[PDB]
Swiss-Prot record:
Protein name, UniProt field: Metallo-beta-lactamase type 2
Source species, domain of life: Bacteria
InterPro entries: Beta-lactamase_class-B_CS, Metallo-B-lactamas, NDM-1-like, RibonucZ/Hydroxyglut_hydro
Cofactor(s) it depends on: Zn(2+)
Gene Ontology BP annotations: antibiotic catabolic process; response to antibiotic
Alphabetic keyword roster: Antibiotic resistance, Hydrolase, Metal-binding, Periplasm, Signal, Zinc
Cofactor note: Binds 1 Zn(2+) ions per subunit.
Induction: By either cefoxitin or imipenem.
Organism, as annotated: Aeromonas hydrophila
CDD domains given in the database record: CphA_ImiS-like_MBL-B2
Chief subcellular location: periplasm
Source lineage: Bacteria, Pseudomonadati, Pseudomonadota, Gammaproteobacteria, Aeromonadales
Regulation: Competitively inhibited by mercaptophosphonate and pyridine carboxylate derivatives. Also inhibited by the binding of a second zinc ion and by chelating agents such as EDTA.
């Protein structure tokens, strides 16, 4: 299918969004409603994700997290706002989105001319620090710059699942916005937290991995240009 929504553990599901360049996002089915982690590429892909959600749960979509300011993590925002879901980010992500959205949409369309010229849609719930959702069962945090300056991690402690959005993946991927020397330092700050991790969900390529995806990407970026 163009998009799939599949249980990884308990209430934690992975979205494989095969539109444009494959991106993987998360959904958490909680007691009061649904939390989406990663808005998906466009308002249309967001609507496609919502369709899949409605086949699983009648509970409201409460909030959607933009794990960075880029089009693959925030492009769906217009749709999520339109259904009354909160759009959530750090302040840093929101500030970078305000200043740089036009630039990232242009960059996206250079690679994907078919991609729409999306107007800016900013988060309406902005956090100054780390934050949690779903009674502490979805835990968002900043550990430094990597693929972008602002990208955050989201950890699901009950299921021992870590999502890093665009940070963790199988191939080097986009380095155009990356802090190549800081990237492994961020990955080491992450590992030093000693979070119990059974599963890492990569944000591109095939999603399902163990904790070693962190080490895999770390080794790749330490050999990359500008390392
Ligand atoms: C700004 C966007 C999100 O990144 P991107 O230019 O998207 C291309 C146009 C598909 C891109 C390029 C190469 C590898 C991965 C990605 C996604 S992080
Ligand atoms: Zn990405």
């Amino acid at each position: 299918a163009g998009m799939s929504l599949t249980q990884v553990s308990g209430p934690v599901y992975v979205v494989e969004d095969n539109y444009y360049v494959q991106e993987n996002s998360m959904v958490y089915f909680g007691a009061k409603g649904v939390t989406v982690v990663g808005a998906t590429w466009t308002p249309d892909t967001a609507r496609e994700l919502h369709k899949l959600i409605k086949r699983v749960s009648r509970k409201p979509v409460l909030e959607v997290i933009n794990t960075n300011y880029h089009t693959d993590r925030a492009g769906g925002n217009a749709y999520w706002k339109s259904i009354g879901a909160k759009v959530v980010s750090t302040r840093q992500t929101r500030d970078l989105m305000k200043s740089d959205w036009a630039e990232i949409v242009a960059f996206t369309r250079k690679g994907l001319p078919e991609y729409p010229d999306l107007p800016l849609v900013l988060p309406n719930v902005v956090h100054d620090g780390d934050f949690t959702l779903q009674e502490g069962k979805v835990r968002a945090f900043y550990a430094g710059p990597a693929h972008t300056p602002d990208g955050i991690f989201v950890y699901f402690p009950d299921e021992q699942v870590l999502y890093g959005g665009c940070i963790l993946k199988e191939k080097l991927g986009n380095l155009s916005f990356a802090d190549v020397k800081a990237y492994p330092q961020t990955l080491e700050r992450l590992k030093a937290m000693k979070l119990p991790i059974k599963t890492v969900i990569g944000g591109h390529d095939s999603p399902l991995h163990g904790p070693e995806l962190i080490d895999h990407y770390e080794a790749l970026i330490k050999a990359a240009p500008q390392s």
